[PDB]
Design a protein around this motif. Structure first.
Motif, PDB file in Angstrom:
ATOM      1  N   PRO A  76     -74.225  33.907 -10.762  1.00 41.81           N
ATOM      2  CA  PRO A  76     -73.960  34.724  -9.577  1.00 41.81           C
ATOM      3  C   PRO A  76     -72.524  35.239  -9.571  1.00 41.81           C
ATOM      4  CG  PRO A  76     -73.891  32.441  -8.997  1.00 41.81           C
ATOM      5  CD  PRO A  76     -74.332  32.479 -10.408  1.00 41.81           C
ATOM      6  N   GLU A  77     -72.233  36.309  -8.806  1.00 44.97           N
ATOM      7  CA  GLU A  77     -70.857  36.810  -8.722  1.00 44.97           C
ATOM      8  C   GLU A  77     -70.001  35.808  -7.916  1.00 44.97           C
ATOM      9  OE1 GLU A  77     -70.569  40.921  -7.439  1.00 44.97           O
ATOM     10  OE2 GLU A  77     -68.387  40.978  -7.759  1.00 44.97           O
ATOM     11  N   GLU A  78     -68.710  35.711  -8.238  1.00 46.16           N
ATOM     12  CA  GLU A  78     -67.815  34.769  -7.557  1.00 46.16           C
ATOM     13  C   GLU A  78     -67.547  35.244  -6.114  1.00 46.16           C
ATOM     14  OE1 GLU A  78     -67.506  35.808 -10.660  1.00 46.16           O
ATOM     15  OE2 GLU A  78     -67.056  34.108 -11.994  1.00 46.16           O
ATOM     16  N   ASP A  79     -67.239  34.297  -5.237  1.00 44.52           N
ATOM     17  CA  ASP A  79     -66.978  34.559  -3.824  1.00 44.52           C
ATOM     18  C   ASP A  79     -65.541  35.023  -3.641  1.00 44.52           C
ATOM     19  OD1 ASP A  79     -69.545  33.339  -3.364  1.00 44.52           O
ATOM     20  OD2 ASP A  79     -68.541  31.376  -3.389  1.00 44.52           O
ATOM     21  N   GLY A  80     -65.377  36.041  -2.793  1.00 40.13           N
ATOM     22  CA  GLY A  80     -64.084  36.620  -2.474  1.00 40.13           C
ATOM     23  C   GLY A  80     -63.993  38.012  -3.041  1.00 40.13           C
ATOM     24  N   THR A  81     -63.694  38.998  -2.172  1.00 37.47           N
ATOM     25  CA  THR A  81     -63.551  40.412  -2.555  1.00 37.47           C
ATOM     26  C   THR A  81     -62.529  40.599  -3.679  1.00 37.47           C
ATOM     27  OG1 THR A  81     -62.278  40.529  -0.498  1.00 37.47           O
ATOM     28  CG2 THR A  81     -64.403  41.644  -0.496  1.00 37.47           C
ATOM     29  N   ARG A  82     -61.398  39.869  -3.598  1.00 41.92           N
ATOM     30  CA  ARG A  82     -60.320  39.967  -4.574  1.00 41.92           C
ATOM     31  C   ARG A  82     -60.242  38.764  -5.522  1.00 41.92           C
ATOM     32  NH1 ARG A  82     -54.734  41.974  -2.414  1.00 41.92           N
ATOM     33  NH2 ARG A  82     -54.938  43.111  -4.396  1.00 41.92           N
ATOM     34  N   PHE A  83     -61.397  38.093  -5.839  1.00 40.98           N
ATOM     35  CA  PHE A  83     -61.387  36.976  -6.810  1.00 40.98           C
ATOM     36  C   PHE A  83     -61.240  37.532  -8.250  1.00 40.98           C
ATOM     37  CE2 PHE A  83     -61.912  32.699  -8.292  1.00 40.98           C
ATOM     38  CZ  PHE A  83     -62.365  32.885  -9.579  1.00 40.98           C
ATOM     39  N   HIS A  84     -60.305  36.950  -9.024  1.00 41.76           N
ATOM     40  CA  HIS A  84     -60.048  37.314 -10.420  1.00 41.76           C
ATOM     41  C   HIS A  84     -59.731  36.053 -11.252  1.00 41.76           C
ATOM     42  CE1 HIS A  84     -59.417  41.004  -8.150  1.00 41.76           C
ATOM     43  NE2 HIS A  84     -59.915  41.627  -9.222  1.00 41.76           N
ATOM     44  N   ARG A  85     -60.386  35.926 -12.432  1.00 39.77           N
ATOM     45  CA  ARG A  85     -60.202  34.798 -13.347  1.00 39.77           C
ATOM     46  C   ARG A  85     -58.790  34.786 -13.909  1.00 39.77           C
ATOM     47  NH1 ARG A  85     -64.428  34.289 -17.768  1.00 39.77           N
ATOM     48  NH2 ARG A  85     -65.824  35.216 -16.202  1.00 39.77           N
ATOM     49  N   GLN A  86     -58.278  35.999 -14.262  1.00 36.41           N
ATOM     50  CA  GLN A  86     -56.955  36.256 -14.807  1.00 36.41           C
ATOM     51  C   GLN A  86     -56.767  35.484 -16.118  1.00 36.41           C
ATOM     52  OE1 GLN A  86     -54.754  35.894 -11.084  1.00 36.41           O
ATOM     53  NE2 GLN A  86     -54.266  38.069 -11.279  1.00 36.41           N
ATOM     54  N   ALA A  87     -55.728  34.627 -16.280  1.00 36.48           N
ATOM     55  CA  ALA A  87     -55.523  33.901 -17.530  1.00 36.48           C
ATOM     56  C   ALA A  87     -56.542  32.738 -17.738  1.00 36.48           C
ATOM     57  CB  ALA A  87     -54.107  33.381 -17.584  1.00 36.48           C
ATOM     58  N   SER A  88     -57.457  32.490 -16.752  1.00 34.60           N
ATOM     59  CA  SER A  88     -58.476  31.461 -16.891  1.00 34.60           C
ATOM     60  C   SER A  88     -59.671  31.997 -17.658  1.00 34.60           C
ATOM     61  CB  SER A  88     -58.929  30.949 -15.535  1.00 34.60           C
ATOM     62  OG  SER A  88     -57.850  30.320 -14.867  1.00 34.60           O
ATOM     63  N   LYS A  89     -60.196  31.196 -18.609  1.00 29.48           N
ATOM     64  CA  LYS A  89     -61.347  31.592 -19.413  1.00 29.48           C
ATOM     65  C   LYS A  89     -62.679  30.974 -18.896  1.00 29.48           C
ATOM     66  CE  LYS A  89     -59.950  31.256 -23.868  1.00 29.48           C
ATOM     67  NZ  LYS A  89     -61.112  30.820 -24.703  1.00 29.48           N
ATOM     68  N   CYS A  90     -62.658  30.266 -17.703  1.00 32.14           N
ATOM     69  CA  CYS A  90     -63.850  29.700 -17.050  1.00 32.14           C
ATOM     70  C   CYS A  90     -64.666  28.831 -18.035  1.00 32.14           C
ATOM     71  CB  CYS A  90     -64.642  30.838 -16.409  1.00 32.14           C
ATOM     72  SG  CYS A  90     -63.608  31.872 -15.320  1.00 32.14           S
ATOM     73  N   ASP A  91     -63.894  27.994 -18.736  1.00 32.79           N
ATOM     74  CA  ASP A  91     -64.201  27.144 -19.877  1.00 32.79           C
ATOM     75  C   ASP A  91     -64.288  25.651 -19.527  1.00 32.79           C
ATOM     76  OD1 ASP A  91     -63.955  29.061 -22.124  1.00 32.79           O
ATOM     77  OD2 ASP A  91     -61.871  28.475 -22.598  1.00 32.79           O
ATOM     78  N   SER A  92     -63.382  25.193 -18.613  1.00 36.48           N
ATOM     79  CA  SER A  92     -63.087  23.807 -18.244  1.00 36.48           C
ATOM     80  C   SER A  92     -64.231  22.781 -18.193  1.00 36.48           C
ATOM     81  CB  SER A  92     -62.386  23.781 -16.895  1.00 36.48           C
ATOM     82  OG  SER A  92     -61.080  24.319 -16.992  1.00 36.48           O
ATOM     83  N   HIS A  93     -65.232  22.971 -17.312  1.00 32.97           N
ATOM     84  CA  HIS A  93     -66.294  21.979 -17.106  1.00 32.97           C
ATOM     85  C   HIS A  93     -67.123  21.812 -18.347  1.00 32.97           C
ATOM     86  CE1 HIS A  93     -69.804  20.247 -14.682  1.00 32.97           C
ATOM     87  NE2 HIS A  93     -68.799  19.378 -14.530  1.00 32.97           N
ATOM     88  N   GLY A  94     -67.567  22.932 -18.905  1.00 32.79           N
ATOM     89  CA  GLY A  94     -68.377  22.978 -20.117  1.00 32.79           C
ATOM     90  C   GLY A  94     -67.705  22.405 -21.345  1.00 32.79           C
ATOM     91  N   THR A  95     -66.424  22.734 -21.555  1.00 33.43           N
ATOM     92  CA  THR A  95     -65.678  22.267 -22.719  1.00 33.43           C
ATOM     93  C   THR A  95     -65.556  20.737 -22.672  1.00 33.43           C
ATOM     94  OG1 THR A  95     -64.542  24.413 -22.871  1.00 33.43           O
ATOM     95  CG2 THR A  95     -63.479  22.536 -23.999  1.00 33.43           C
ATOM     96  N   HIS A  96     -65.192  20.201 -21.501  1.00 33.77           N
ATOM     97  CA  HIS A  96     -65.078  18.763 -21.314  1.00 33.77           C
ATOM     98  C   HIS A  96     -66.392  18.068 -21.594  1.00 33.77           C
ATOM     99  CE1 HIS A  96     -64.380  14.940 -19.219  1.00 33.77           C
ATOM    100  NE2 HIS A  96     -63.156  15.103 -19.708  1.00 33.77           N
ATOM    101  N   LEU A  97     -67.501  18.573 -21.031  1.00 33.06           N
ATOM    102  CA  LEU A  97     -68.825  17.957 -21.227  1.00 33.06           C
ATOM    103  C   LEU A  97     -69.329  18.044 -22.665  1.00 33.06           C
ATOM    104  CD1 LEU A  97     -70.411  18.957 -17.849  1.00 33.06           C
ATOM    105  CD2 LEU A  97     -69.715  16.673 -18.473  1.00 33.06           C
ATOM    106  N   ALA A  98     -69.081  19.156 -23.366  1.00 33.89           N
ATOM    107  CA  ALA A  98     -69.415  19.264 -24.786  1.00 33.89           C
ATOM    108  C   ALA A  98     -68.606  18.215 -25.575  1.00 33.89           C
ATOM    109  CB  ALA A  98     -69.081  20.653 -25.295  1.00 33.89           C
ATOM    110  N   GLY A  99     -67.364  17.996 -25.167  1.00 34.17           N
ATOM    111  CA  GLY A  99     -66.534  16.973 -25.780  1.00 34.17           C
ATOM    112  C   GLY A  99     -67.057  15.571 -25.514  1.00 34.17           C
ATOM    113  N   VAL A 100     -67.514  15.265 -24.271  1.00 33.46           N
ATOM    114  CA  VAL A 100     -68.019  13.917 -23.949  1.00 33.46           C
ATOM    115  C   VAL A 100     -69.303  13.626 -24.754  1.00 33.46           C
ATOM    116  CG1 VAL A 100     -68.930  12.401 -22.102  1.00 33.46           C
ATOM    117  CG2 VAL A 100     -66.869  13.752 -21.691  1.00 33.46           C
TER     118      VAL A 100
END
Ligand SMILES: [Ca+2]
Lengths: 214, 582, 222, 11
Positions: free
Chosen positions: B125-149
């Motif tokens: 789904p689209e992110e909440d907030g009219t002006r929401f921007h990932r910017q320098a974030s690659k939206c990687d965090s949760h998935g990368t950690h779990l693939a590592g575990v």
């Protein structure tokens, strides 16, 4: 629910000295299977209990065997007196379940029927009916054909045939053929014949009466 | 009989998008035709509609964007089984493939490079907030950690494990039931057109109970896939959440280094009968998306789920033909028993919550306890505990907090045995507790013995040669309007017979298996405080657990790993049947 | 002397109820379980339910839980079974039987004594008594040593009928033919054979009994 | 590294 699947007919061995039926269960009932004898109009009679133990008074000609899911019941030197229905039942689990029953059939020397014809009674004719009765008694085999004639012409409708179960005394059969007509329809004819065709003769047994005589 | 389902939790509802589920044998041509029929019918009423996706493979149906005004119209469509409103989900040797449905992933991190394959499947789904921007974030965090575990080189559980990533959660860690559904259908379609190798699916997410998500999970489980999910981070009963509530998936709760259930702010790990087991889920080192060699400590039931996905992947690399029933039984068998401090859970949820913390292993009879849902308070209400298709119902017990019970019955329902517990006149309700086992070449059956008030015929046993008694159930056979009199116990002669009242019918589980050997154990206290216990020794598996005497002194009885527990009121005995193979 | 006497045959309208009874004697009534079983023509016996008369506690086959209702009366020394909301599927012969245990095992018993059965006919039709007609031979030259006579029992309902010759004096050579339906009513006949020496000098009489209509007719052959 | 010790992966 445990399913009892009983033999359709008795299977012979040793030249008809041993006759048997099998009874198979859907699941393992160990040895919890009893066998009964039931003669028509009478209460079941316990024969074998716990797959192979004979109840008190039961003849040593009756035996039972098996365990788990296949059980056999056998009659040695079967007599006319043993003509009845036989059924099994499991008591390993409730609801208790029984086999369908199997009627004992026995072979015998062939015998011709004793045919006897009877006219309608005055008591019946006064009440508008006319049943002409023929009795074909103590014959063997069971297969027989009965032909009715009214003034020499063959009759098809109105005839009802009823056999008895194989005889407990002599293993023979007995049948009754009955032509039922209305009083008016009966009045219009004079000679009623009844012809029994059986394997004991090429020539049929014929019995008849003429209303005009006596 | 065509029903409409929406999320119980109003803030997690997503009106406007609906999953239209059709009847079992509906072909793709019928789904497409039904979808077009809805569009045409809606257009006739002056409403634009958009068929987002036509389902085939996992289930028959389609996904539609339309006004809720058109619901009554869609429920009248032909072939419809039910319609479910979309809702949000939230973030919480042989070669085995582990599918991960989560966020994007840093596939070049040293911890997981060469072991993770990004599938290109993306549905968020689209992110909440009219002006929401990932910017320098690659939206990687949760998935990368779990693939590592699951499979990280240095901090992973199954260091030798192949992984395939599907993006089902956005930057805010939010997904939809519709997107997860499409991800599961992708996995199924991959299985059909690809190998006969073991599949593990890690669903580290949770939403409100979902009829359709649970069905989709049941279909993949029956197709041989092993689904592992997070129990939820809501300090609540996991049966109210999905995929957690689905009985075919392996639901994992989180515990910490001091064997306590995990606390996550004001909430924490979920609990109850829908949780299969617990696993490490607090301060878990794993790969960080910050840099290609960075680590990070995270907490939650998704961390706990990843440990079990790792363990499953290890078990499946060793024995790849291992079935899902066999794997769940093995996961429960090797876990640490009765180590969790149950004080943290609500008192009425402790009995129902398993006391198992996962662990790797270091022919055989395996049993697990299956608790039912509570029955209603109706005097003729019943509770049902069911086993997995491959498993045998070896025993059935019951329990009421008030102790007002009619007993229980091991009865056939849909060709399979189920453990049905019956409530009593004036009773609050009851639980049914099945004991579901995997017994090699087993030929089991339940035999029903009648009430035995005469002086003989009281002894109920597996009288068949080679058949052995694995469990007894007792059902009270006097009518509620009949004159009540204190129950009388059937005497005890032989040790391997059922225990029970003369006024009850007894249902005996009789198994015939090659090397099956089974025995009875007892232990009684005169005036017990809360409970009485008896346990099978090392090498033996608890198959049946019964209580003595009746309702007057007892609330019920239940298996707890290899311990038979009898809950007394303020000579109570615990009777256990212990079984073993070869 | 150990025996179970069952109540006579019944006729009942669809939707009505019957209370069948089973009178026990020659043993301690309260100490043995009594069972009820259903027998339809082509089918195998179905177990309905059981009762311990000592306590009156029942145990039923789930399939008959609603239909059947067992009860014991220690004074009368007899067990009852009430069948409710009857239909043509309940037209059958009902038997009562006693369980006799010989051991502690739940499989150490057997059905040692039974009742003769109670026929239940479920029908909107009315009870009609039979018309008994003598079948006597007319004119002729005798051949052989014996003569055959008979009785035609016609137009009765339901099937419960018993024919006996003289007063059971002649049980041989006697044949009783199964009944058949004749436009809704039963028709049956019976043959007796006696030596030429006896009939017509000696008198022969069939005695027909139709209990369902509480009637007995003695037709004399001449 | 408690988590890996807890599941019997490290000593
Ligand atoms: Ca045994």
């Amino acid at each position: 629910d445990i399913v009892m699947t009983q033999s359709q007919k008795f299977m012979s061995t040793s030249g008809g000295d041993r006759v048997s039926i099998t009874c198979k269960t859907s699941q393992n009932v160990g040895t919890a299977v009893a066998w009964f004898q039931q003669k028509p109009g009478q209460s079941p009679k316990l024969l074998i209990y716990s797959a192979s133990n004979r109840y008190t008074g039961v003849s040593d000609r009756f035996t039972g065997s098996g365990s788990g899911t296949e059980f056999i019941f056998t009659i040695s030197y079967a007599q006319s007196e043993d003509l009845a229905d036989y059924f099994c039942h499991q008591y390993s689990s409730y609801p208790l379940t029984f086999g369908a029953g199997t009627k004992l059939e026995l072979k015998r020397a062939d015998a011709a029927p004793t045919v006897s014809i009877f006219p309608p009674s005055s008591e019946q004719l006064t009440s508008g009916g006319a049943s002409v009765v023929c009795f074909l008694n103590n014959f063997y085999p069971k297969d027989i054909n009965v032909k009715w004639k009214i003034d020499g012409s063959e009759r098809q409708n109105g005839v009802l045939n009823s056999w008895t179960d194989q005889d407990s005394k002599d293993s023979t059969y007995s049948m009754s053929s009955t032509l039922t007509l209305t009083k008016d329809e009966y009045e219009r004819h004079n000679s009623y014949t009844c012809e029994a065709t059986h394997k004991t003769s090429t020539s049929p047994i014929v019995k008849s009466f003429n209303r005009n005589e006596c | 009989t065509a029903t409409f389902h929406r999320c119980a939790k109003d803030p997690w509802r997503l009106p406007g998008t609906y999953v239209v589920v059709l009847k079992e044998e509906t072909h793709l041509s019928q789904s497409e035709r039904t979808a077009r029929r809805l569009q045409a019918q809606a257009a006739r009423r002056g409403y634009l509609t958009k068929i987002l996706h036509v389902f085939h493979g996992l289930l028959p149906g389609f996904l539609v964007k339309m006004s809720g005004d058109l619901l009554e119209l869609a429920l009248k469509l032909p072939h419809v089984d039910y319609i479910e409103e979309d809702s949000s989900v939230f973030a919480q040797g042989s070669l085995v493939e582990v599918y991960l449905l989560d966020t994007s992933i840093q596939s070049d991190h040293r911890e997981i490079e060469g072991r993770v394959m990004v599938t290109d499947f993306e549905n968020v789904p689209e992110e909440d907030g009219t002006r929401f921007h990932r910017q320098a974030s690659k939206c990687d965090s949760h998935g990368t950690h779990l693939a590592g575990v699951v499979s990280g080189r240095d901090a992973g559980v199954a260091k030798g494990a192949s992984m395939r990533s599907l993006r089902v959660l956005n930057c805010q860690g939010k997904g939809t039931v519709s997107g997860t559904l499409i991800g599961l259908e992708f996995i199924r379609k991959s299985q059909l057109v690809q190998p006969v190798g073991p599949l593990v699916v890690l669903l580290p997410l949770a939403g409100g109970y979902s009829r359709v998500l649970n069905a989709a999970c049941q279909r993949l489980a029956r197709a041989g896939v092993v689904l592992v999910t997070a129990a939820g981070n809501f300090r609540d009963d996991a049966c109210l959440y999905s995929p957690a509530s689905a009985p075919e998936v392996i639901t994992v709760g989180a515990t910490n280094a001091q064997d306590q259930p995990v606390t996550l702010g004001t909430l924490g790990t979920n609990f109850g009968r829908c949780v299969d087991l617990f696993a490490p889920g607090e301060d878990i080192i794993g790969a960080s998306s910050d840099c290609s060699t960075c680590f990070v400590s995270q907490s939650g039931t998704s961390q706990a789920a990843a440990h079990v996905a790792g363990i499953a992947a290890m078990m499946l690399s060793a024995e790849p033909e291992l079935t899902l029933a066999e794997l769940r039984q093995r996961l429960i068998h090797f876990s640490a028993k009765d180590v969790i401090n149950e004080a943290w859970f609500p008192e009425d949820q402790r009995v129902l919550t398993p006391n198992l913390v996962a662990a790797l292993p270091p022919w055989q009879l395996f049993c697990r306890t299956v608790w039912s849902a509570h029955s209603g308070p109706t005097r003729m209400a019943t509770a049902i505990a069911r086993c997995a298709p491959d498993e045998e119902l070896l025993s059935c017990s019951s329990f009421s907090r008030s102790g007002k019970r009619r007993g229980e019955r091991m009865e056939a329902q849909g060709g399979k045995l189920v453990c049905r517990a019956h409530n009593a006149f004036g009773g609050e309700g009851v639980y049914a507790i099945a004991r579901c086992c995997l017994l090699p070449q087993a030929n089991c059956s339940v035999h029903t013995a009648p009430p035995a008030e005469a002086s003989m015929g009281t002894r109920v046993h597996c009288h068949q040669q080679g058949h052995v008694l694995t469990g007894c159930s007792s059902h009270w056979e006097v009518e509620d309007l009949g004159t009540h009199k204190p129950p009388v116990l059937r005497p005890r002669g032989q040790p391997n017979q059922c225990v029970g009242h003369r006024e009850a019918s007894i249902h005996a589980s009789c198994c015939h298996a090659p090397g099956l050997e089974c025995k009875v154990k007892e232990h009684g206290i005169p005036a017990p405080q809360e409970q009485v216990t008896v346990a099978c020794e090392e090498g033996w598996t608890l198959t049946g657990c019964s209580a003595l005497p009746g309702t007057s002194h007892v609330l019920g009885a239940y298996a707890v790993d290899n311990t038979c527990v009898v809950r007394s009121r303020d000579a109570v005995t615990a009777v256990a049947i212990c079984c073993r193979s070869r | 002397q150990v025996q179970l006497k069952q109540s006579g045959a019944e006729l009942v309208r669809p939707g009505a109820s019957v209370k069948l009874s089973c009178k026990a004697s020659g043993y301690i009534f309260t100490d043995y379980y009594i069972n009820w079983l259903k027998k339809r023509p082509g089918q195998g016996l179905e177990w309905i339910a059981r009762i311990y008369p000592g306590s009156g506690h029942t145990y039923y086959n789930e399939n008959f839980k609603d239909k059947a209702t067992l009860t014991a009366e220690k004074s009368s020394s007899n067990v009852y079974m009430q069948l409710s909301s009857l239909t043509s599927e309940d037209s059958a012969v009902y038997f009562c039987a006693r369980e006799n245990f010989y051991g502690s095992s739940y499989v150490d018993w057997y059905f040692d004594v039974w009742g003769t059965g109670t026929t239940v006919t479920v029908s909107s039709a009315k009870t009609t008594p039979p018309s008994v007609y003598p079948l006597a031979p007319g004119c002729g030259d005798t051949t052989g040593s014996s003569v055959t006579l008979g009785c035609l029992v016609k137009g009765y309902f339901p099937e419960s009928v018993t024919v006996t010759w003289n007063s059971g004096s002649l049980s041989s050579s006697v044949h009783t033919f199964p009944a058949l339906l004749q436009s809704g009513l039963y028709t049956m006949s019976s043959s007796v054979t006696v030596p030429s020496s006896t009939w017509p000098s000696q008198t022969v009489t069939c005695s027909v009994a139709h209990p369902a209509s509480s009637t007995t007719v003695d037709k004399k052959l001449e | 590294x408690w988590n890996l010790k807890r599941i019997x992966l490290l000593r």
